[PDB]
Write a protein that binds this ligand. Structure first.
Ligand SMILES: C[C@H](c1cnn(CCCN)c1)c1cccc2c(-c3ccc(CS(C)(=O)=O)c(F)c3)c(C(=O)O)[nH]c12
Ligand SMILES: [Zn+2]
Ligand SMILES: [Zn+2]
Length: 232
């Protein structure tokens, strides 16, 4: 009824949208992994009379549900999608998207890693993002490669019309007490990658983590802090 929806409010398989700013929504879904249930976020950005999707809803049936929810609540077609790293909470559902006519994109680094993991593989490669600090435009967003953090390939997304920073899994929510799933992370480089985000997007007004509640720029420093406590 208005507050951001949390893991225990979303049954696995359903998707909810949350209006972030004019023409910007997050999408929230939940999924089981190794016997526990987790929420995860993605983004939807209006692109004239079309929509740009950032990240799947973590699984084929969740992603089908995402498309249905977008049709019900927004009613504009999703024409393109970008996945911000290779894990299943970002690419699982790409095959559903591709069968629904969505053009799916990721960096070559994400595509390679997805293929090697046995995860679904976006169709199109995003060049111009291979060195930390790189930025490219993609529809109504800017894609930025901050360097290795949660994963070596993680991208962040900025919506300049609204000053919305979508951190993906490189950014954690304020209530987080540890650094999430770090199996593919670079804990030593993560703070430097966060500092690059902070320097490049000093006017961000909303910061959205890969999992959990949006907030403001605090999420960036908090992320660095929880990652340092983990490496320690
Ligand atoms: C799909 C993904 C994954 C990551 N790696 N692998 C290994 C490769 C295997 N094929 C799979 C995955 C599965 C389960 C949970 C998480 C969390 C996560 C966990 C806990 C928290 C709470 S917290 C910050 O307080 O610790 C959280 F927010 C997110 C994150 C994240 O961190 O992005 N990914 C997750
Ligand atoms: Zn991940
Ligand atoms: Zn994640």
């Amino acid at each position: 009824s208005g507050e951001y929806p949390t893991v225990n409010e979303i049954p696995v398989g359903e998707v909810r949208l949350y209006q972030i700013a004019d023409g910007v929504w997050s999408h929230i879904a939940t999924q089981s992994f190794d016997g526990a249930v987790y929420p995860s976020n993605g983004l939807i950005v209006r692109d004239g009379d079309e929509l740009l999707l950032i990240d799947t809803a973590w699984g084929a049936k969740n992603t089908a549900a995402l498309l249905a929810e977008i049709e019900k609540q927004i009613g504009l077609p999703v024409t393109r999608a970008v996945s911000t790293h290779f894990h299943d909470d970002r690419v699982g559902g790409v095959d559903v998207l591709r069968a629904a006519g969505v053009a799916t994109y990721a960096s070559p680094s994400t595509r390679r890693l997805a293929e090697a993991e046995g995860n679904e593989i976006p169709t199109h490669s995003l060049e111009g993002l291979s060195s930390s600090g790189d930025a490219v435009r993609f529809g109504p967003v800017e894609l930025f490669y901050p360097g290795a953090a949660h994963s070596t390939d993680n991208l962040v997304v900025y919506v300049p019309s609204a000053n919305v920073l979508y951190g993906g899994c490189a950014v954690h929510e304020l209530s987080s007490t540890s650094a999430g799933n770090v199996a593919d992370a670079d804990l030593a480089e993560w703070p430097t990658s966060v500092e690059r985000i902070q320097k490049h997007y000093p006017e961000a007004e909303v910061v959205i983590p890969g999992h959990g509640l949006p907030g403001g720029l605090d999420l960036l420093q908090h992320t660095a802090n929880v990652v340092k406590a983990h490496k320690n």
